Amino acid sequence: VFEWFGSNESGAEFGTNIPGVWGTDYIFPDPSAISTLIDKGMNFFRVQFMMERLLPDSMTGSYDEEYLANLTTVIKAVTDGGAHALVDPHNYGRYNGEIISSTSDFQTFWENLAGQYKDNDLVMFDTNNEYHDMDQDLVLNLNQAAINGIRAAGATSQYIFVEGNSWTGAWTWVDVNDNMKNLTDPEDKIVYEMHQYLDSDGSGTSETCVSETIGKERVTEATQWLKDNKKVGFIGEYAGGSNDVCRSAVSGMLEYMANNTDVWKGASWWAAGPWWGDYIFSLEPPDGTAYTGMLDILEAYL
Ligand SMILES: CC(=O)N[C@@H]1[C@@H](O)[C@H](O)[C@@H](CO)O[C@H]1O
Numbered sequence: 001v002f003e004w005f006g007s008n009e010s011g012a013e014f015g016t017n018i019p020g021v022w023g024t025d026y027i028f029p030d031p032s033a034i035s036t037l038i039d040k041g042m043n044f045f046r047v048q049f050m051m052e053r054l055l056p057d058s059m060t061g062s063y064d065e066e067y068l069a070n071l072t073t074v075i076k077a078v079t080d081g082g083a084h085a086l087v088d089p090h091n092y093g094r095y096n097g098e099i100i101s102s103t104s105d106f107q108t109f110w111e112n113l114a115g116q117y118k119d120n121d122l123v124m125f126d127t128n129n130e131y132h133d134m135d136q137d138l139v140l141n142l143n144q145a146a147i148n149g150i151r152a153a154g155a156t157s158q159y160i161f162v163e164g165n166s167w168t169g170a171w172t173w174v175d176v177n178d179n180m181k182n183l184t185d186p187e188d189k190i191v192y193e194m195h196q197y198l199d200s201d202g203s204g205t206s207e208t209c210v211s212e213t214i215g216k217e218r219v220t221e222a223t224q225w226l227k228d229n230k231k232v233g234f235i236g237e238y239a240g241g242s243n244d245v246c247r248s249a250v251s252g253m254l255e256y257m258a259n260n261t262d263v264w265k266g267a268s269w270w271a272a273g274p275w276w277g278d279y280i281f282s283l284e285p286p287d288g289t290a291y292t293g294m295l296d297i298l299e300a301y302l
């Protein structure tokens, strides 16, 4: 149906504390729980990490090789299972709490990182999670700095998932992120990643969806934008509560997208990972609320 259809794998970006310590501020996803979702048919995992944990000094400096080693382990569990792994610096366009205004530093950051992965054909690169509250020209230039660095590293087979401003939301895309059409890639493998949630404010913090059709309504304009500008997209985060109204909303949203696979390459549920507990949107097996409450809807596309 879609090129890629899967789930986020969260944990390594958890907590506020930098460094933080493994096991008390953050954890990495669990390869067994991933393997279990791969067995359900998923072929795409968006793997979260925090830049400040990978890069303890500056973003152009050297790595925490143990954090990096652990990230690469999770990526390899995915790619060895035959699935695509999207590497997501879950950073909101910010490094150490300040907006990334150095386009050159960000380019070097990505040149170094895609260097780690350049020979893995199953890796994809997400420039940054949910740019927001920042200059719209800077957003564009940071995404192009990422594409430039990634290609400079020799990573040429990999898709690059670019994000816009307004938390890369689908429902606001056409009002803020029109300049993002200007991005260019020598490999022609850019994919526009938007997020969309279904609660009253689109924050993805309530179990309750506005209506049975809210999901479709929130991705309509983005879909026309992609068509008009001859681009391809992906819903890198979505979710809904385990209840009849949201099930109807999620379903309708995915059905609409499935009718527009000319522009929609697929989606990834927010989220799986080992530290969600009783999270309203947990897709972690054996007992996450979405794992048992929503996964039957998703299996339509697997
Ligand atoms: C399963 C494993 O290796 N656990 C270690 C833990 O014993 C130690 O507290 C710390 C330092 O390396 O982090 C974990 O990785």
Ligand SMILES: CC(=O)N[C@@H]1[C@@H](O)[C@H](O)[C@@H](CO)O[C@H]1O
Binding pocket: 022, 028, 066, 067, 070
């Ligand atoms: C289960 C496991 O291997 N745990 C290790 C942990 O020892 C270490 O604290 C951390 C550094 O982020 O790397 C993890 O992979």
Ligand SMILES: [Ca+2]
Binding pocket: 018, 019, 052, 055, 056, 057
């Ligand atoms: Ca630091």
